[PDB]
Amino acid sequence: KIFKPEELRQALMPTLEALYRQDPESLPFRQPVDPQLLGIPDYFDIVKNPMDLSTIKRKLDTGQYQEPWQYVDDVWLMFNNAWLYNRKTSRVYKFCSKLAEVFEQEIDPVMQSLG
Amino acid sequence: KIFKPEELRQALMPTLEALYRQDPESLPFRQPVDPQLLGIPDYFDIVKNPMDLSTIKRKLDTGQYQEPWQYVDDVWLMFNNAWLYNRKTSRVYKFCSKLAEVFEQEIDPVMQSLG
Ligand SMILES: COc1ccn2c(C(C)=O)cc(C(=O)Nc3cc([C@H](C)O)cc(-c4cnn(C5CC5)c4)c3F)c2c1
Ligand SMILES: COc1ccn2c(C(C)=O)cc(C(=O)Nc3cc([C@H](C)O)cc(-c4cnn(C5CC5)c4)c3F)c2c1
């Protein structure tokens, strides 16, 4: 099933905007992880394929998604990376769970409406 | 009194490194405040001269300080900006306070040793 870029942007962007409006929980996800700046030099030993909101947003704006599951996969990639790297008790881990909750609620209706 | 740039770097850089060493607490100060990315588009209504650890670091590394009190003033400019802009109860405000404690302790003997 193939979709047009503007169609996916209009359908999917509101679910991404919903993640951005979570404060302070979106803040760890707004730009790409920068290991040197963050003092976490082992980041890419654990995480092989980085992902973040700014990257997902660019892909939606530049027509790089053809099918809604490609977008959903990037969103889950971002969350799975943060769950993998960070300890269960850390502030980033919990912020991640909060965003994933918000995502699960926002994405389901949109996915049913697309078919 | 004229100070050699390499002399100021060697003497003062340990005081900056001590701030960087504060693990969660240095994080809001490691790069310049980015109002669009952080979702705080009034920042520059309130904060007239932004300052942060990476700017202070680059100025020490490239010899932009003529005397020790210019360094010290940038460090307070950073803390005062954060104290001013953010609420008394906010995470950033309280991280600022921990950094400025660490700075108050470290800076006394170094400023004696230069004069
Ligand atoms: C210090 O150890 C870690 C370990 C993992 N991460 C990650 C990820 C996504 O894993 C993200 C970060 C990380 O600190 N991201 C980050 C980035 C930025 C801005 C957009 O540049 C702000 C925050 C942030 C978090 N809370 N706050 C509010 C107190 C002000 C800001 C942030 F966590 C991080 C830090
Ligand atoms: C959400 O509203 C505000 C309002 C003011 N600031 C300020 C300053 C300096 O005023 C700094 C930030 C800010 O979030 N900075 C920032 C940047 C980055 C990385 C280095 O890019 C990480 C953090 C950060 C804070 N806590 N954490 C740990 C949870 C992981 C990361 C951060 F707060 C901030 C956010």
Contact A75, A103 (CB under 8 A): yes
d(CA B25, CA B46): 22
- The domain tally of chain B equals 1
Kind plus residue range of the DSSP H or E element containing A104:
helix A91-114
Is the bond preceding residue A109 a cis peptide, omega within 30 degrees?
no
Contact A88, A8 (CB under 8 A): no
Query: Which amino acid type is present at position A41?
Result: P
DSSP B28: G
Shortest-distance Cα residue to atom 16 of ligand 1? A28
Q: Tell me which residue range forms the domain holding B94.
A: 1-115
Nearest to B50 by CA among B36, B68, B32, B35: B32
Residues in chain A within 8 Å Cβ distance of B23: 39
Q: Which of B27, B31, B39 sits opposite A23 (nearest CB)?
A: B39
Nearest to A24 by CA among A108, A96, A112: A96
d(CA A102, CA A23): 12
Ligand 1 atom nearest A96 alpha carbon = 9
Tokens of B3: 């100070």
Nearest to A99 by CA among A16, A34, A14: A16
Query: Which amino acid type is present at position B58?
Result: R
The answer to whether residue B27 neighbours chain A at the CB level (below 8 Å) is: yes
The answer to whether residue A58 neighbours chain B at the CB level (below 8 Å) is: no
DSSP structure string for B76-111? HHHHHHHHHHS-TTSHHHHHHHHHHHHHHHHHHHHH
Residue with tokens 């404690």: B101
Record: contact A39-B31, CB cut-off 8 A: no
Torsion, CA B8, CA B10, CA B13, CA B17, rounded to 10 = -170
d(CA A50, CA A82): 10
Query: Which amino acid type is present at position B50?
Result: P
